[PDB]
Amino acid sequence: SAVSALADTTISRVTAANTAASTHSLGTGRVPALQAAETGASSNSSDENLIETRCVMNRNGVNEASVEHFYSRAGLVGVVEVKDSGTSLDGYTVWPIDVMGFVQQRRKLELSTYMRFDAEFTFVSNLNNSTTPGMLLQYMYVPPGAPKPDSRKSYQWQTATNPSVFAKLSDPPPQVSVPFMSPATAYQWFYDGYPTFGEHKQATNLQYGQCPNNMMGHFAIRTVSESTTGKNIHVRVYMRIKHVRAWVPRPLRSQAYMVKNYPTYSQTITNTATDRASITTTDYEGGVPASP
Amino acid sequence: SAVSALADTTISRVTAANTAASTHSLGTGRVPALQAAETGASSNSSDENLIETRCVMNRNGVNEASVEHFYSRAGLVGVVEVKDSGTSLDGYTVWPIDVMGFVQQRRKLELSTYMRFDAEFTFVSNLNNSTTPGMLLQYMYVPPGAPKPDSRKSYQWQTATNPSVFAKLSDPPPQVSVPFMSPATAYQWFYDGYPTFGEHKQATNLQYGQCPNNMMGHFAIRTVSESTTGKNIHVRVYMRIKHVRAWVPRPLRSQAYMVKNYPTYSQTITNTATDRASITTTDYEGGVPASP
Amino acid sequence: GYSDRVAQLTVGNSTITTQEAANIVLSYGEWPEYCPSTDATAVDKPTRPDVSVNRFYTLSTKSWKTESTGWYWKFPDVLNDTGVFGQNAQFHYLYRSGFCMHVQCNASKFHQGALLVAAIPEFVIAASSPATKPNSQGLYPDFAHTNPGKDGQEFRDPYVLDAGIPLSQALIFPHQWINLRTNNCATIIMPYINALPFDSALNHSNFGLVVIPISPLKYCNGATTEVPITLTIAPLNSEFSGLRQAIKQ
Amino acid sequence: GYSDRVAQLTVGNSTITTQEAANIVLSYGEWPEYCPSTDATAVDKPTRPDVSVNRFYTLSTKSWKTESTGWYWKFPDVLNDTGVFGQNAQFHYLYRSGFCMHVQCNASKFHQGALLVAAIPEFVIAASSPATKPNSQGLYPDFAHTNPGKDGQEFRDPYVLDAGIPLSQALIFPHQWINLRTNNCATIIMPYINALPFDSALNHSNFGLVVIPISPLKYCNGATTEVPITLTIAPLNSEFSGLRQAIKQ
Amino acid sequence: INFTNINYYKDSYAASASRQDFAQDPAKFTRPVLDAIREAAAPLQ
Amino acid sequence: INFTNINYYKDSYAASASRQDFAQDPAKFTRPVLDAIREAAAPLQ
Amino acid sequence: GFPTELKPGTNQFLTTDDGTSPPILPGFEPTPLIHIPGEFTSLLDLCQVETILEVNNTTGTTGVSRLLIPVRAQNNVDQLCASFQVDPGRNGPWQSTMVGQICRYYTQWSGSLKVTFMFTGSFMATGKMLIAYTPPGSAQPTTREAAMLGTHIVWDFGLQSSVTLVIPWISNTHFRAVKTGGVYDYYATGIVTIWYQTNFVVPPDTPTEANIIALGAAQKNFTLKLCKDTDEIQQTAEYQ
Amino acid sequence: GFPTELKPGTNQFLTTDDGTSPPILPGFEPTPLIHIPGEFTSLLDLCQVETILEVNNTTGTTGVSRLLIPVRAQNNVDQLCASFQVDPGRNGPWQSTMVGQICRYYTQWSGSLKVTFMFTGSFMATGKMLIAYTPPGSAQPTTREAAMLGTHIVWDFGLQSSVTLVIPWISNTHFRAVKTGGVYDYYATGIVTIWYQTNFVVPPDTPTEANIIALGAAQKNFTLKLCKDTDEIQQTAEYQ
Amino acid sequence: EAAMLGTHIVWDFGLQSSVTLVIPWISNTHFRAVKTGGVYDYYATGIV
């Protein structure tokens, strides 16, 4: 039956590569150390061929370095303030879904060019003093094209088709699983192109790189209230990525980000490696030499 | 199937050693009472060989004296104060993980030299008046090398990779299971050596005995708040040790501890045994002698 | 068990010979292929002008100087106005193809220097803003920098690839070096990489083709100073669908 | 079914004979062994200088007096500057070995006293602070007390082993008595005990070797007053890896 | 006895992460060349 | 009918304590000698 | 969902509850486990290791001197050498033993005890001792005639310098409480006294006073029960 | 209903908890999955790709010049060309590498490293270098005589313009912490130094100064553990 | 301390009143000349 299925669910360990024993070699024509980096291939030299190694039955597990385990970790992707006090008595807010607003999630995602995945969104909402009184909130997901709400009472909150979640602040954080929603085969964190045709002779040219396949609508959030409450609510949106497929790895971003949807670095370029005094100095005192 | 597995999970009793019947022995060359303690071996003399015993089918269970049962008991290992009032309006605190701060857990752990185990950490947090209002807390584990937070708002709280737990004070105590995290094969409560090379001619010599294999980073705790709350929170960390492996048992500490990471006893050495009047006095009145 | 230094690439009516070649990079170990019927989405029958468009195009020659920063091209954009390929890219809405990029740079045995020839998929060009907040025009690069055409565009900050990513890690992309003491060419065969089976050859540029001098060109007085760098490319297995009036851009 | 009083220990080019011996303690019932390939981590081939280093070294002789407190040594530290073993410990980063410690103390049949010879793994030395709080220098022992070298260090408070643990329970460690009426030597074979397969012979001391007089030495006028205590040890199955310049400390 | 990797909803994307398919094939990034080079050989001969 | 010692998570260190492997071998601390001494014999003969 | 009802004991935190907990590090594989000599799997193996009894725990005696039982040449016959109670958890000579310190971590104990006496006098010194163990109900015997009525051994000094006096498990209950004193003397074990069977005889020119070292441990049938927290060391502030 | 009891950890939100969640869109079928070239399934495949080391990370050196190791004709013998530490997570030349940047996402690493040096001088320029890797315990060697006592390779400039110096996994622990400095120098890996075995000899009319490019990567037995959050880029405000 | 680095025996006085120290044949040549002194110290055997 399916008892065999549930038994084979523990994370099975696959170990790192073993090291075989080797000896000295004195001859010509066998040069595993000489390489040709111009070929664009990394060196295939092994330890066994450059030093005399021992037999090491390596048992270090490599399972944690997979793409899934690297990404399936809920990180902050959005902070939404439901302003209902002071000068803005809205009691609602429509947040454009974009996971490129915060550095930690953004840098990890931009390791790859294309990504196809499902997500598990979690909403951590509370007041400014971190308290969570019982206050009914409605988190409505507005897909691209659905009518967006313009008040706390407008008809769009009927949600007769839009998926909606009702939860008080005192409840545990709401959590929903979102499928891979995209007209394309994968989300594209980098789109070297323009969404529409034209001359693209604009002074700003803000449309460059904006692929609508990644734009997945808005998350409309409101307090289910009859009037103004005088309390501001902060909704922190956490996205955990599951069933991941990544393509075309990229260099990890080295310059500080400046804007959400564009690569844009300051003119004061920071070096990837921190500076040192000279090319022959290292800060490692080591031990006392036996006979200097 | 696995029904046989779940059936054989009750703690099976193994009893203490039985005593066999014995009789008087009158002869030479057979001296089970004479020993040689100089050999470093404990005496192998049995009751059967020194008195006339009866047959006792002993049924006293010995399972409670195992290492696991002795250690798998959650004890206090750390008290963290999240100060957010008075002169320190931090709302966060970074506590260096060290289980050697409290005597009861420390003395039990130092029974052995090396220990390899998993742990189940539990956090009991409350205000000073022992109340637990709904207040969102974040307990982030900062492994050695990860950037430590320096404010309640700093970017490190994004936790895009660092494991983080969000829980209100009113919730039941958060509980997580931590694996055996160490570059070594086992944690080493006693390290007769120095971490680095050098002359070690320092005036203090505080590096003696500090093995970095035991240093496992920090636990960063904060209230998820927009500003100061004016309330101090006390987080009590309890560690339950499971899947225990102990090596090289040691004498149990007899002098009072003075510092966290070092054996250091006061110059007023306390005797291991409490004093009595003379070597021939015992405080046991007993009964009335029949014929003195 | 080794690679020969001589090579000849014949596709279409064009043939490229080289006598000091390192190897041929097959990007991600996949050959260019036509769209399988399992992955296609458009129902119009595609056109496959086999030998009229799948052929080598020598496009631009840049002069390598001692203070050069490097240049980059965008693959579909660099061929949109040349030959029968350019016409099919202008007459059809949808397009897909691989390519075989071939960069040529020869110098004497008394010159020195090394180029980094890499094919970067989705090479989104960044603009360097002078720390200006209010979303000024200087926050996004103009069209001349995103689609340089056939003349290419020389790098402003090659250290960050003009994209905020470190140049040192550009070797994660299909790359090849032109080390003047070792070889005089670099060959990269690149399959069609995109999240869609077909796409517009005008709006979207699938690959960026960068040529960056890591070790500067150095020589002594008396040697030939003009050391050119020629970019020759050839589409492979190019299809087009969605015929309509020719659209320039 | 008993143990003979005579014994001879031959390792290397050294041989130790004794005619009043109690037994030979095999610590934790495990013999010294080379690191198995299943437990090793360093990939460099270790060196095993079989007979040049695995041999008996007579290191220090302390005079037992009636008011003596005892002495202690640290096993890797006591041999770091003697013979071929010391050189290999200075030239190599990694080291592992067992040992066979042999303490010799003979006296007439008219003397009396008993020593406690124990081999303490990870013998972390404590400092006795005069109830001072502000983390003064007197909170940690100096290097002369942690690594005494070959001369050893005499105990300050033998009752607490200079470590805050009671001496009465030191018998939980591999130990042996030298009771002057019974035997004149103590032999302890100790395998390599450490949480790592190899370790530095300079920083880390695997074992502490204590010799503490429990019953004080007593005799009458006319007997020989100078009663020495000699410590002879021998590494067993010693390996070294990670060769580099010789480092003293 | 492990009781996990069970989906309680009708839609497959609601299941937990698929962490049982670890595959490692670095040849597509480390050796993306046509003529395979033996280790013991001079690459350009 | 006992329903325990079941692990609900994919990682093995999340399971409860392993309290079914009690082993007692005191010989390594009580008789750590080379020549085994019989009880009825004089140890040093 | 599945209909359930929460029972009492919900949300409680029992410090001795062996349950599961979510792991913080998915896919974590710890460092490989190499062989380390000297592994112990039960505390009963530790209680069977002989450790020194602090019999001379008298006021004024300091340091290592507290571990020695003085024995000397007597001027009279049938004199008392030393005595101590054999309650392991009681404040006294058994506090310095590994069995005595592990017993304080448990509420109740059971099984036979074991005391090994090692004579550390001259080779020329001879003597005989009567080491008697008096079961409960009687105070410490006042004369050797009264002590020899209980479990005793006559010890002869010779080449075999050690003797073992087994304290048999003579009790009414299957277990004895570690706590003693007050109404808990119901669990008292008894008194061990050392008497001079004959004198301590020496030739000329040899010390007339020697020491006996007592090593206490547990027998094979020793057992502990109801693990608790010890009372050996106190703490008034965190060790920061 | 079914009697249940809630345990500790109820209502908590663990960000690394692989559990189920209700789907928002019933009956949703995503876009078909077509084949895209260049899929990677493990980050260890990325750490094995050679990327340029920023060895010339000195003050004043700007831009691409930081990726070049200057080598020139020497006037003396046995001179030091360059040096750097081989700790991947340490601030330094390894920060510019793909292995160095992925290591910063993990707490501990293990396995052999790999540095490939490419000479970019004239075809007419010849030379020999001694690239030595000094295991921990010693500072950077002061002379070539001291450096050659460790793992080293003698590199001969020729038609094969690249050489590979493998840094063997010579460590006491199975893993090394990525963090270094302070007491974490216990996990230091060592120093790689480049020395002139012979001179850098050139004919007339050819440049006397060239560059060496260092490409660092990982070996087949490389491993990472205990995924954490990196410290490479900071943020002070949302990118809106 | 310097003498114990060579071939040695530790002799314990007891009922067995005699001990034997074997001087092993540690030489470079198969034979040693009986004559010694001068350049013939090349055939020296050593010191006990």
Ligand SMILES: CCCCCCCCCCCCCCCCCC(=O)O
């Ligand atoms: C009930 C409310 C649930 C919320 C539904 C969330 C739906 C989110 C869509 C999936 C997010 C991933 C795609 C994000 C890509 C946009 C990034 C960008 O290019 O700026």
Ligand SMILES: CCCCCCCCCCCCCCCCCC(=O)O
């Ligand atoms: C989500 C937060 C969870 C907390 C994670 C805790 C990780 C603790 C590491 C394991 C603790 C045991 C090792 C302690 C050794 C240090 C003692 C010392 O030598 O001072």
